[PDB]
RNA sequence: UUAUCCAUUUAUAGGGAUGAAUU
RNA sequence: GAGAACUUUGAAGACUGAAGUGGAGAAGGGUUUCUUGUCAACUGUGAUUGAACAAGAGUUAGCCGCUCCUAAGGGAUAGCUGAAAAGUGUUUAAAGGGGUCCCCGUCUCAAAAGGGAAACAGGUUGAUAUUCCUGUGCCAAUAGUAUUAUGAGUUAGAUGGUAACAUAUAUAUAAAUGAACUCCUUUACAUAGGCUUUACACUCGGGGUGCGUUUUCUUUGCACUUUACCUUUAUAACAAACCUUGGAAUCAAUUUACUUGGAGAAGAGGUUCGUUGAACUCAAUUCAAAAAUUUGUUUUGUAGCAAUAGUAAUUCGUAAUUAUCCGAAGUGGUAAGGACUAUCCUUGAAAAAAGGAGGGAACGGCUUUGUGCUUUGCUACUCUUAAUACUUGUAUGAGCGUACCAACAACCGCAUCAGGUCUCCAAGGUUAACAGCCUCUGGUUAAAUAGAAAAAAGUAGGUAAGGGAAGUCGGCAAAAUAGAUCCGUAACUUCGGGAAAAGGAUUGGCUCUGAGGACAUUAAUGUUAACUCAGAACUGAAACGGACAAGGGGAAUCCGACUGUUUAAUUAAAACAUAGCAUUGUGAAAAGCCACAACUGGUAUUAACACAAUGUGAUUUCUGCCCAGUGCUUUG
RNA sequence: UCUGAUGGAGGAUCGAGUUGAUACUGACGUGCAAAUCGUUCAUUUCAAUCACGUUUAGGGGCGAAAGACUAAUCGAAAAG
C-alpha cells in the first residue's frame, strides 16, 4: 500500500476508469470554494495590513 | 484498534452518559464519563449571560468559592451591568420627573 | 442567475399540491418570512418567531402580531379608531 | 352493533387533551377592589406560545397590594402588545389597546377580546386567534351592554363585565393552506386525538349507522333529529337547512 | 438478571438448596427435583 | 499531589505535626536529579532538585521524627 | 331573598368628587 | 482412555472479517459460574466431551447502581354517591413546616436509559473487582464547652480597577456581618445545515531495541517505543460577550453562509466566561540592563501525579541487575464543545437540590446604680479553619445488588428449534461508502452423524450453435447496462418537473506535462504539504467501473393526485388516510357533542380563526332541474 | 431582464442498516419453523423507527377501517 500511495502521488492510478464516486464525492466543491475563499481573503488582509492597498480598494476587492 | 465498553452502569448514550476515551499508563484505551456542560447564569432582566461568574452545575456551584459566584457591585450576579446602569438612571430620573410634576402643579 | 421563472420560494414543494395551493401559500410565506420595521429601534429587523410572536433581532423586544405579518389590517384600523379619540 | 367513535370520546381515555407542554390557563385578573374602583397596571414581561392554541399568551406581572410581592397572570395577548408595555386594568383604566375595562365604560363601536360573559369569570369569550367582538350598544340605564360576537350573534352582557381592548393576535392563521397531512398531524398532536377522521360510510354497519352496503353510500337521510340518542346522532345534527348557502 | 431484590435472591437460594438429593445415610434405612433448563421457577 | 517550589514552605510543611513520611527519589537524567515528597494527611507535596548539593543538605537538615522512604 | 342553583377567589379595601414600592 | 472423525496438545489448510459466534450491559433465566471428580440416563452418530450427574467453592463498594426528585400516571384522605361491593378524588375541609402572632401547605407511590454529592491508575484469583491489594485522591457529615493555633476585621461588618471586573494561596484562597419579606438564576431540554476547535482513532518519516526474510533483491518487512483521576491544576491559545479610548459615506469590518455599526463601526488597549488541561519559558534556576524590584540569555522537570507503574529487550543464584521509553508531520473516521444560520397553524418536561441579589431586623468586652432599659472606672477586643481535652448513649461512611448467559445450546418459541429479542465500542486495503470482497487484533474450525460411490429424479445453480417470445392466460423465470467523466436529451407540464428521458463516447498500466497552498528577508531569493483535476507519449491477443458492486428503456390506456396506512398466518390494491372543498350543531356551566347506576365527568389549561358531527377527496374547469315522497327543520 | 458563483430548502431522489413483505404463485409443506429459508422487492428527515414506563377491558376497548386487533383464541376474548 505504501508503493501504491507513492504511485498515486506520482498520479498513477486516478484515471477516469478508477473513479467510482462522483466528482463532488471525490473532492467536495464546497470545500474547494471554501479553501479558495480563505486563501483570497487572507491575501487581501495581508495587503491591507501591509498598506499595499487602500481600505476602500480592499473592500471592493 | 482497541475497543471500549461502558463502566458506569448506564449503557445508553443519553446526554448524561457522554464518554471520552483516554489512554492509560498501562497501555489500554478506557472510557471516562464526561460531566454535562452547565448553562451560564443569566441576567434577571435581559437574560444574557452574567460575566465574572462561573458556569457550574448546582453540585459544583455549591462547592465553588464565593468569589466566582458573585460580582462586587449593586446587584452583581443577577443583573448585568448595562441593565444596572439603565436601572440607576431610571430610578433617579423618574423621581426627578415626579418632583418637577409636583412643583408645576400650582 | 434567475433560478425559477415564477415558482419562487415554493420551489421547495416541487410538483406536489396544486399550483393554486402553491401560489396561495407563496403569497403568504413571502410575508411570513419577511423582515419588518421595528418601530422601537427603527431598524427593519423584526422577524416572526412563532405563529403570533414577532421579535426584533436588535432590541430583543417582541410584540404580538398577525399569523403571517407583523400587523393585520383589522387590528391596524381598530387601533386607529381608538387613537382618533 | 358496537359503540361508535363519537360515543367513545366522552369516556376520555385516549381522547383527553394532549396538554403536557401547555403553559397554563388563560384567565385575566380575579376581581379586586382595585379593579372595581380604580385602575391597576401590570407590565407584560414575555409573549409566549401555548402549544394547544394559536393565540400568543402574555405574561403580565402585577404588584400585589394585600402583601408585598408580585403576581403573574397569563392573558391572551391582543395584537400589538409588546414586552415592556404597561397594561392597565380597572374601571378607570384608559381606553387603549391592551387595557382591561368594563364593557360599559367603552364607547360603542370598539373592538374587544377576552370578554367576560358574566362579571368576574375572568374571561370566557372571544379568545381564538384573530377574533374580536364589537360593542354595538349601551343601555341608557347603564348596567347593560350589547356586543356582536365573532359568530355574528348579538349578546347582552351586564356593563360591569370586563374585556381587553383590541383584537386577539395571530390573526389570519386560517389563511394558510395546511399543505399536507403531516402538518395536520403536528397540528393535532398537541391538541387531541381527533385526526385522522375516517368516514363512517367506509365503515361496517356494526360500528356506524353509515357503514355497510355494496356501494359506500348513506342509504337514509343524513339529517338526524335533535332528540336522536347517542349512537344515532351521526349525520348533520338537527340541520335547519342543507346544501350550498346563497346569502 | 444481575440486578436482583433481596427477597428474589433469597428465593433463588432456597430453590437451589432444595434441589439437592436425599442424603445417602437416610436412603439406607427425591421426586421434587428440577433442572434450571427444563422446568422454570416462574417465581 | 501538590508541588511546592520554595524551600521555606516545604520545610514548614515538614515541621508540621501532621506529616508522616518523606519519600526520597533519585534518578539519572542525562547527574542525578532527585525529589523529596512529604506525606501529609491531605496531600503529598513534592519538590524536585537538579542541585545535588541542595538536595543533599536538605534531607539531612530535615528533622528525623518522620519516616524515610527511599524509592531508588 | 331566605330555599335552591351557578361563577370567582388568597372568599383580601363601604358609596359619590421594561427601576422599587413590604418591617 | 477399555474404546477417539466430533476430548486435549502440536503442525497445516481455511472461516468469522470490527454491521464479528469479538468485548461490555438491559429484559428474561437462576448457579448454567469455578475447581475436582465423573458417565446410569441425556448430550437424536460416537463421546473419555458437556450447560448432564456428584462433592465442595465462588459474588467484598462512602465514590458503580438502587435508595432521593419529579413525569406520563397509580393508590389513598375529605367529601359525595351506592344495599354494599365499589365509583370519583377538594366538588360547604377547622387538613405538617417556618420564623416569633403571623406566613406557607392533601398524603403516598411511580424512571437501575430523565434530574442527580463524590475515583483513578497499576496489580491480584480457579472463580469477584472503578468493590480486593498498593498508591494517590475526592464527596458528605462532623454536638456542646474549653484550650490552643491559622487568618482576617474592629477603637457595627476589608480593599483594589475609569470600567468590564478583581482580590483571603493559612498544610487547607476558611472567614469580606447581615433577620423577616421578596425577586431571579442554575437544574432545564426540539429539529436541519454546514463551518470550526479539541481529544481519541488511523497513517507517514526519523532514532533505539527485538524478531523475520536473505538462491537473488531489500540502509528492508513487522512489534514495542506508554502515562490515569486529582492539583479552584497554573498558564498558553481561541469562538464569543463586555469595558476604555476612538469617532465611521469614497461606508466600513467580516463569514463557507450572513452578520454588524451614531442605540457608537474600524483601529488600539483590556475584562470575563466557555472550551481545553503543562499548551506557553510554565515553574524553580545561571548570566546582564531597571533601584531603597522589571526585561532579555541559560540549567533542570515527561509540571506535580511519574516511574517506583506499564511495555519491549539483555543478562545473572533461580529472586535481582542492566539499557530504552524521543524527534517531526499527514488523513478526517468517531465523540464532544463552540459560534452561527434555518424550520414549525409542531416552539420541543417537572421537581428535588444549589446559587445570586434586593431589604436592612439585631449588635463590643470586665464591673457596678436602680428598674431588658441612662448611668459610673478600664480596654487590648468579634468572626473563620484546624487540632486537642472533657461532657454528650457507642461522635464516620447504612441497607440491598454484584457469580454466569445474554443466545453461538444458558431467554421466549413443548427442545441443545436455521425463528424472535433493546443498547454501546468498532482496525487495514479497494471504494462515495459503517456497501460488497479480502485481511490484522479477538474468536472459530462447531453445527441431530460420518465413509464410499456418484446413475435416475429432486433441489440450488452455470453454459449453450441458428432463431429470438414462435412459449405462456400473461415475457412467469432468466437475460440484457447498470459506476464515474464528457456529450446529448422529446412530447407534455401545475413551469417546480418530465430526466439517469431517449441516446452516444471514454475508462487499464507506465513515463511524463500543467494547474490548485503554507512558511522570510532587504521590487527581489530559499524551505516545505495534501490528493484532486486536465493533457500527452508509450504499451497490450482492443483490454481496462476486468472480480466485487451496479437502472432495461420507450409509445399509450385505466385507476388513485402525491408522501403515507392496511386484512400478524391466502387479497398491499383501484381500498383507508390526506391537503383542498362543502354542509350541520353550539354564545356555555339551564350551551353543543359524548361518558356515567348514581355522584360526577371528557372536550376543557377549551370559547366560533373554537369544539363537535358528516360527506367529498390535490390542482384545473365545472358542479344542471326536482321539496311531489321520505327525512330534518321554522312559526302559531 | 439575463449570466456565473454562493447557499443548502423539501412529508425531494438513489441506497446499505432498520422497518416491512411485491414476485418466483421458488424451496419447505411427516418443515429448521403451528408462517421459516433463498433470491427478488418496498422503506431510510419523517404522518419515520426502537425501548421501557403508562392509560383504555369484553356487547367493552382500540381501529389512516381489513370486522382488523384485544397473549397461536375475535362477526363478541379467556377462565370458572
UniProtKB/TrEMBL annotation, chain A:
Q: Does the keyword Repeat apply?
A: no
Give start-end ranges for the coiled-coil region(s). Answer: none
Q: What is a GO molecular function of this protein?
A: structural constituent of ribosome
Domain of life here? Answer: Eukaryota
Per the record, the GO terms for biological process are: translation
Question: One Gene Ontology cellular component annotation?
Answer: cytosolic large ribosomal subunit
Keywords, alphabetical: Ribonucleoprotein, Ribosomal protein
Similarity comment: Belongs to the eukaryotic ribosomal protein eL19 family.
What is the recorded name of this protein? 60S ribosomal protein L19
Q: Give the species this sequence originates from.
A: Plasmodium falciparum (isolate 3D7)
Shown chain mapped onto the complete sequence: 62 to 122 of 182
Automatic annotation (TrEMBL), chain B:
Q: Please list where the region (Disordered) is annotated.
A: 1-25
Which residues fall in a compositionally biased region of kind Basic residues? 1-21
Give me any GO biological process, just one. ribosome biogenesis
Record GO cellular component, one term: cytosolic large ribosomal subunit
Q: Where does Mg(2+) 1 bind?
A: 67, 70
Print the keywords alphabetically: Metal-binding, Ribonucleoprotein, Ribosomal protein, Zinc
Domain of life, per UniProt, equals Eukaryota
GO MF terms listed in the record are: structural constituent of ribosome
Q: Where does Mg(2+) 2 bind?
A: 70
Task: State where Zn(2+) 2 binds.
Answer: 43, 83
rRNA processing in keyword set: no
Family affiliation: Belongs to the eukaryotic ribosomal protein eL34 family.
Q: What is this protein called?
A: 60S ribosomal protein L34
UniProtKB/TrEMBL annotation, chain D:
Keyword line: Metal-binding, Ribonucleoprotein, Ribosomal protein
Q: Does the keyword Ribosomal protein apply?
A: yes
Isomerase in keyword set: no
**Pfam families documented for this protein:** Ribosomal_L2_C, Ribosomal_L2_N
> Domain Large ribosomal subunit protein uL2 RNA-binding, which positions?
10-89
Which SUPFAM superfamilies does the UniProt entry name for this protein?
Nucleic acid-binding proteins, Translation proteins SH3-like domain
Q: Which residues form the signal peptide?
A: none
Gene Ontology CC annotations of this record: cytosolic large ribosomal subunit
Q: Which family does it belong to?
A: Belongs to the universal ribosomal protein uL2 family.
What protein does this entry describe? Answer: 60S ribosomal protein L2
Q: Which organism is it from?
A: Plasmodium falciparum (isolate 3D7)
TrEMBL record, chain E:
Describe the family membership recorded for this protein in Swiss-Prot or TrEMBL. Belongs to the eukaryotic ribosomal protein eL39 family.
- Gene3D superfamilies membership: Ribosomal protein L39e
Q: Name one Pfam family in it.
A: Ribosomal_L39
Classification via InterPro entries: Ribosomal_eL39, Ribosomal_eL39_CS, Ribosomal_eL39_dom_sf
Range of residues in the leader sequence: none
- Keyword field: Ribonucleoprotein, Ribosomal protein
Q: What is this protein called?
A: 60S ribosomal protein L39
